[PDB]
Amino acid sequence: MNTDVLINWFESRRGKLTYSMYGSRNGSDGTADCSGAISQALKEAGVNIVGLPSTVTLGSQLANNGFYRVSKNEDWNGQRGDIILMSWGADMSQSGGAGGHVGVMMDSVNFISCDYSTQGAVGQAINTYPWNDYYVANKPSYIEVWRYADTAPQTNNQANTAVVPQSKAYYEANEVKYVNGIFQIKCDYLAPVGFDWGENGIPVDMVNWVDANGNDIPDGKSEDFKPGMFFSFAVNITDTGEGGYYGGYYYRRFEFGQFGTVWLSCWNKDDLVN
Template identity: 40%
Template sequence: MQYDQQHIGKYWYVFDEMSGAMLYGFQTVVDSLAKKTTKIVYYDTSGHMVYGWQQIGRHRYYFDTLTGKRQVGHVTIGNTSYSFSNSGILSSWIERTINWFVQRKGKITYSMYASRNGSDGTADCSGAMTEAIWKAEASRPDSSALQWGGYNTVSMRPWLTQNGFQNIINGTAANNSSYEPRYGDVIIWGDLTGAAGHVMIVSRGAGHNANVISVCGYNDDAYHQAVQEFNYDWYYAYDDRPSFHVYRLSNPLKS
């Protein structure tokens, strides 16, 4: 595709050279005419080139604050070293936790009475969340929890706190509007265990556009349909607006 870069006001834009249409998303553009090099940048839905930390879909990226170039490999930002894949995706706890669920879509059947952690092809919400966060490099769960396949939605809360999550809000339907979901939030519904509780993680977007992913019994425990991803606002209303408890990593970029 031929393109035309233009600097308009304080923003860079890119247009298709043939149609004149404004382009969005990841684009490969000229980095240096003299060196004949290119760079990958990102244009948001307003057509603006983005800079710095960005959450795009399920992933977090970093774009050079001067050039907009997508960063890959090991990069020092401030005083901290970060690792990015060849496609620019940050390696982080949140990324690995969400990937645990994404990689098991269409492979897990809901059950509270078998492994609970997916090891036998079945799982429930809290067993799966325990396993996902643990394998993202959290501390080993207590043996008393592991013998039952993981924590439940009440017993996991101190473990989340021990691993750098902060309990940022506890609420009900009455104050739900004061909570703005963020990427990586672990949300627990209810104050009881078993089927009366549920846990999920914000997998993309934020606020009213946030999606959450979890293991659940949606579709009447259909075979291999336990991993589901829903819009959070819709899901909260669908589940009759339960009490909720939100845990957020104190360092959302934690590698």
């Protein structure tokens, strides 16, 4: 991904595009919409976007092309090339038409996009604002921010268990947090980029406590499991058989009983467990 090319696509078209969801979408007829513009810029920047996705499907294409989420409806440390998807529904599945927007950070402060902020004035589709001001003005109910993993050619859409081999199937808890009514683990080895508690958090109640050398120890209460403690996996852990790409890695979708789905960067349940 050539970030200079991505941002120059927008900067070079200030004064030269008109906003429309009904024309070429990508500026080839002098008109573009938000998602056609970013898709075209991303292609020109060397990202293999197929067609001209909407805001409903762009995230999935970014995940398959080495990007990961740095924010889901949170504050974050902005950097040039971050791609912001936003909705006026609960997530991007509800972002069709005027319900969705997308643009790109030029730097830690300024956001550029093809938008309706100039009410469709001729030539005036490409607009730049400080993100903090754009957000308070436009008030989307959901935002997600995508960032390219520069390691994506090297990790090559492999499971992190293959990228970073370890002989022992046990893991460290980097963070332990009460989320959605249960104590859960953030394990950086299993979720190496773009961790999200909802997508990647591991229920403490479904792990086996082990010492720093992987030796089985007695399982304490879940509210007593701490960051820097270790764990392994010994029947209510289900491999759904569904895989996906994200941030240049393979992830596998598990289900932890009624606690729901957990995506982890290993090939399958046999790679995960002891």
